[PDB]
Design a binder for these strands. Structure first.
Lengths: 49, 336, 45, 97, 241, 325
RNA sequence: AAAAAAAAA
RNA sequence: AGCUCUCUUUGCCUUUUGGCUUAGAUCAAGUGUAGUA
């Protein structure tokens, strides 16, 4: 939870965001919707990648 | 299952869990010729948890045509009738409000003799029956008679050739007109009948069906016969070469007759490409079969509306104007 | 969709795009490819 | 409709910006407020609305010792501290209470 | 939308236009220390210096000769209300003078608007304001009256309407170049930028109540005034709840 | 243009006899009628130049070329009346409407303000406003339905809110005295209760039966107005509460082997068992001696079907609604 | 105490 | 051991990239359905 809002403090609700910020916002909302898969992906990346 | 929400008053084709009778007939139809297997993809406690029978169908359907039919039989006392199951008390209020908006019923919940019977005895959807019965008092009738023939039709006219995308777009634009999908259907009928010589292979190059649309031809014959027992002479001027009337005003006449008959289903296009109702609450999208799917419009009428699993689609778009709707629905619309 | 795995179509279009535009204009090259960004084209090369 | 700027400078307002007209049915009144003064009212400095740090630290220490006091004689009584006994201690403390 | 840089800059300058319109009486000031006072064409708005955002917003407010149509609307409303009160005022006839079509925005010289021909020689008073009650009737008698209406777009420093109509009546009856049909008339001034009204000059008995009631009625419900207020409200995007 | 659009329109579609056929799909001519999002549109004017023309609509020019006037000029009207001839007793008294002082764009945005709304006595499509009204307590108790007149004509024909539609029910009562069956049971004539509406959950997914699913998280908490900062210079909300930081916080008051992965049903389905079985009831006795009593167009009738529903219900013996009386 | 900056049979 | 024509190889380059700077700057995107006939 905490990590997500830190990233979302970087971007105001409105704005002219380019592609990578909206990809990040999509990833953050996806993490909010599906947290277990996000945490498992984070641990897999942290072990493997 | 098809359901009909009466508060919003829209259809919905939604994926419901099956009934115990449904999974029962599932297992029964599994093992027909040899002892077979069933593969219900859910747990046994879930199997205990489904309802025993299907949802009653009169609680999730348009009660407007069946209240119309029950009045056509003569049982006006629809409240005191021996139904097998009682319908919801407010869905039929929406139904009879729909009946009043089409005329038919009076202020005193009685069928009107001249018009109400004439919408009553037809086997067509009531709103466009009201469209048809208003044509003679205003003008052109055979064109919307043809549209009534082809709207009483379920399977689509255009065959789905997945190998053609710009070609099917061209052969739709071979017939298409900007003033609604109804004029496109009228054009395909007039192309098939006047010069087509009832020929199926011509429909085979034109990506068109054969059986359902000649069934619609028979439907047009039946509607013309039913109006012949209405005592109104049929103005069959299509065979005549009298084209001296200007076609723009006649197309305006056709869509004006439609908006007299389809005043309830009115929507406005929003600049993100969507459609909203008069209240501006429900989100409506153009169905991916009309030409108006990819065209600009301001105010539209649609033959039907249905809620799918994700988006609400509206069908048979036709262009209108605002002051037409203010003129022809004084009891139903009023300016701000 | 702006993601996926690299197909043969995309690799050949990327190489022809690099032949025309060079290795310092990845936004033109990525404009050629529908599903790939300038960073993804650069990473693929 | 103004710009809403906040000021940190000594900006005096001449009294010509203290008059107003009003229309009535028996006449029109052109009021000029501040006639009894020959003194201009001054634009409020922002720094007079911000509590100095030293006093804020002192009150933070004092009101947190008070909070520990009410926690000690609150847990030997009720189970949760209310929002009436801490209304006096509301916007105090560097970790605000 | 896919939008050009001139249009980007126009959209970016819109709130500055609204701010400049809102604070226009204190920006378009008279105490200025320098600035060539020019008049905006076909209006009575005087500009000191060049402020382009103020000028473009004021042109948008007063499009399509709206100053002239306001003047015509107010004078014809006054003329018809005059037409309802001939009998008690001993007015023999009422006339609407329409010699100069574009006099509503000329501030150097003015002409009469409405003429009232009297059946009997009225005893005019000393020239007094509309809200002045100490009427001093003089023994000089006359048989003709005229009503002049003028529109003022006042500013923050000069929007006293009584002194304005006093100065205007004395200046337009002192000089010989301005032609008035009778020596006794009534000057009516309408401060358009603050919604004020005043009248100054002679009065035959019974006129004062009619003028004040009619003026209140038409400041409440003139149509051209209404479209002026609607244009200002749309320009500010300032609404009432 | 001209000849090309005409003859390729004639070539692509002679079959559109009614209406107007679509403009040709060519690289030369443009398809004006097709939709072109909002992030693809160009802002053009009536003429068709990328240019704005207002003080508050983003233009560097307002009025008739930075002038309050017009091309045609303006001419005042004459107005003469007296005792012999007055204006108010005139036959054609032209009143002063506030629309001859308006411009074409004033009329345009005035009719833009004139929104269309459905009437209060008839329900429109998707009118979703009663949910917040009903869930208000005493406000929902005092405020009632807005008397859509289908409901009141149903009241006229003998229906009451709180119960449904059907034949009369000869049930005694529930007095609220428990479940006492010692009442005399003289069974007044009542009406059937309303069946509840079905409110089906939205199924946008292929999730299986009985699956609650992976639970989703929530974000961690969360003289009126200003002039504005422009719609392009807003970027994102760089105009907050100017006085104090942060969004305001909500405050608490106090502190055979089956298939792999497939389980076997312990008990069979009852009706896949009674399909073999004989059922719960025997066939009738059928004694000897009984014998069969009898030994071994629609369109044209519909043409002559002149029976009105009044005489139809008279000969079918169905009670009718009361009319005007 | 104007210009950029509001298009070539 | 010549002169013409043909072919190959060698030469030739013959339509053979005409400045600058913060690579001059920036660059997400309409809708795609379809228990039953």
């Amino acid at each position: 939870i905490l990590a997500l809002e830190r990233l979302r403090e970087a971007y105001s609700t409105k704005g002219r965001l380019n592609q990578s910020q909206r990809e990040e916002l999509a990833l953050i909302e996806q993490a909010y919707d599906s947290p277990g898969t996000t945490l498992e992906r984070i641990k897999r990346f942290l072990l493997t990648q | 299952l098809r359901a009909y929400n009466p508060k919003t008053g829209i259809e919905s084709l939604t994926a419901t869990p099956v009934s115990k009778a449904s999974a029962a007939q599932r297992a029964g139809r599994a093992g027909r010729t040899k002892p077979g297997k069933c593969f219900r993809l859910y747990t046994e406690e879930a199997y205990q948890s489904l309802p025993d029978a299907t949802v009653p169908e009169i609680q999730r359907s348009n009660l407007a045509p069946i209240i119309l039919q029950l009045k056509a039989l003569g049982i006006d006392n629809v409240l005191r009738f021996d139904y097998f199951t009682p319908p919801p008390a407010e869905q039929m209020t929406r139904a009879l409000e729909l009946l009043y908006s089409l005329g038919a019923l009076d202020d005193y919940a009685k069928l009107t003799r001249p018009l109400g019977l004439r919408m009553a005895e037809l086997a067509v959807e009531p709103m466009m029956a009201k469209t048809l019965l208003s044509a003679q008092s205003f003008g052109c009738l055979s064109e919307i008679l043809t549209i009534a023939a082809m709207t009483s039709l379920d399977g689509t006219l255009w065959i789905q050739h997945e190998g053609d995308k710009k070609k099917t777009e061209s052969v739709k634009r071979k017939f298409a007109a900007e003033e609604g999908d109804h004029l496109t259907l009228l054009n395909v009928y007039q192309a098939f009948v006047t010069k087509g010589r009832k020929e199926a292979h011509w429909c085979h190059e034109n990506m068109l069906n054969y059986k359902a649309m000649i069934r619609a031809v028979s439907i047009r014959a039946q509607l013309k016969r039913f109006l012949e027992r209405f005592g109104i002479d049929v103005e069959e001027s299509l065979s005549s070469p009298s084209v001296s009337q200007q076609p723009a005003n006649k197309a305006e006449k056709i869509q004006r007759c439609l908006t007299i008959g389809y005043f309830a289903h009115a929507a406005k296009m929003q600049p993100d490409g969507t459609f909203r109702n008069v209240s501006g609450t429900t989100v409506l999208h153009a169905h991916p079969s009309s030409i108006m799917f990819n065209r600009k419009a301001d105010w539209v009428i649609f033959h039907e509306v249905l809620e799918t699993k994700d988006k609400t689609f509206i069908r048979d778009i036709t262009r209108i104007k605002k002051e037409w709707l203010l003129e022809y629905a004084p009891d139903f619309y009023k300016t701000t | 969709v702006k993601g996926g795995v690299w197909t043969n179509i995309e690799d050949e279009i990327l190489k022809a795009a690099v032949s025309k535009y060079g290795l310092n204009q990845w936004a033109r090259v990525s404009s050629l490819l529908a599903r790939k960004t300038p960073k993804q084209c650069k990473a693929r090369w | 409709g103004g710009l809403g700027m906040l000021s940190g400078s000594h900006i005096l307002i001449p009294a010509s910006d203290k008059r107003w007209c009003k229309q009535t049915d028996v006449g029109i009144t052109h009021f000029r407020a501040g006639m009894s003064h020959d003194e201009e009212t001054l634009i409020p400095n922002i720094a007079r609305y911000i509590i100095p740090w030293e006093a804020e630290f002192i009150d933070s220490q004092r009101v947190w010792t008070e909070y520990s006091q009410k926690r000690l004689e609150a847990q030997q009584q009720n189970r949760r501290l209310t929002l009436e006994d801490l209304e006096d201690s509301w916007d105090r403390g560097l970790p605000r209470i | 939308k896919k939008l050009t840089n001139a249009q980007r800059s126009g959209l970016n300058q819109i709130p500055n236009r609204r701010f400049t319109l809102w604070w226009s009486p204190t920006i378009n000031r008279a105490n200025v220390y320098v600035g060539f006072q020019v008049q905006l064409d076909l209006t009575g708005i005087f500009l000191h210096g060049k402020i382009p955002t103020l000028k473009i917003s004021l042109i948008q407010i007063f499009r399509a000769h709206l100053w002239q149509k306001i003047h015509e609307s107010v004078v014809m409303d006054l003329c018809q209300v005059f037409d309802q009160e001939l009998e008690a005022l001993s007015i023999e006839s009422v006339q609407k003078e329409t010699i100069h079509p574009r006099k509503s925005y000329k501030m150097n010289s003015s002409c009469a608007d409405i003429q009232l021909f009297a059946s009997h020689k009225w005893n005019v008073t000393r020239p007094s304001l509309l809200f002045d009650t100490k009427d001093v009737i003089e023994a000089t008698t006359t048989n003709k009256f005229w009503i002049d209406v003028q529109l003022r777009y006042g500013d923050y420093d000069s929007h006293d309407i009584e002194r304005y109509v006093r100065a205007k009546y004395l200046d337009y009856t002192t000089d010989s170049m301005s032609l008035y049909p009778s020596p006794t008339g009534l000057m009516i001034g309408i401060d358009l930028a603050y919604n004020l009204y005043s009248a100054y000059g002679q009065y035959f008995p019974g006129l004062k109540t009619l003028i004040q009631q009619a003026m209140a009625k038409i400041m409440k419900a003139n149509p051209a005034l209404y479209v002026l207020r609607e244009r200002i409200r749309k320009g500010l995007q300032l609404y009432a709840s | 243009r001209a000849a090309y659009e005409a003859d390729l329109t004639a070539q692509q579609s002679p079959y559109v006899f009614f209406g107007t056929p679509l403009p040709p799909l060519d690289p030369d001519v443009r398809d004006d009628g097709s939709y072109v999002p909002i992030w693809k549109q160009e802002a053009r004017d009536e003429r068709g130049r990328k240019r704005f023309h207002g003080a508050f609509t983003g233009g560097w020019s307002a009025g008739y070329f930075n002038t309050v006037g017009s091309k045609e000029g303006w001419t005042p009207s004459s107005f003469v009346s007296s005792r012999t001839k007055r204006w108010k007793d005139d036959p054609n008294k032209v009143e002063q409407r506030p629309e001859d002082f308006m411009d074409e764009e004033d009329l345009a945005d005035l009719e833009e303000s004139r929104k269309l709304q459905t009437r209060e006595a008839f329900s429109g499509l998707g009118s979703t406003a009663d949910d917040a009204v009903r869930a208000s307590g005493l406000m929902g108790l005092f405020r009632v339905e807005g008397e859509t007149m289908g409901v009141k004509l149903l009241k006229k024909m003998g229906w009451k809110e709180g119960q449904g539609i059907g034949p009369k029910v000869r049930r005694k009562a529930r007095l609220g005295l428990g479940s006492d069956a010692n009442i005399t049971e003289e069974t007044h004539l009542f009406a059937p209760d309303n069946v509840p509406m079905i409110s089906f959950v939205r199924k946008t997914d292929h999730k299986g039966l009985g699956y609650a699913g992976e639970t989703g998280l929530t974000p961690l908490s969360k003289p009126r107005g200003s002039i504005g900062v422009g719609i392009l210079n807003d970027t994102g909300s760089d105009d907050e509460d100017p006085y104090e930081l942060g969004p305001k916080i909500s405050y608490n008051r106090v502190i055979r082997l089956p298939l792999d992965g497939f389980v076997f049903g312990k008990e069979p389905d009852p009706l896949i068992s009674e399909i073999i079985a004989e059922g719960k009831y025997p066939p009738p006795r059928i004694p000897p001696g009984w014998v069969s009593s009898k030994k071994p167009s629609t369109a044209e009738a519909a043409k002559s079907s002149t029976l009105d529903p009044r005489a139809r219900a008279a000969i079918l013996g169905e009670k009718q609604l009361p009319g005007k009386s």
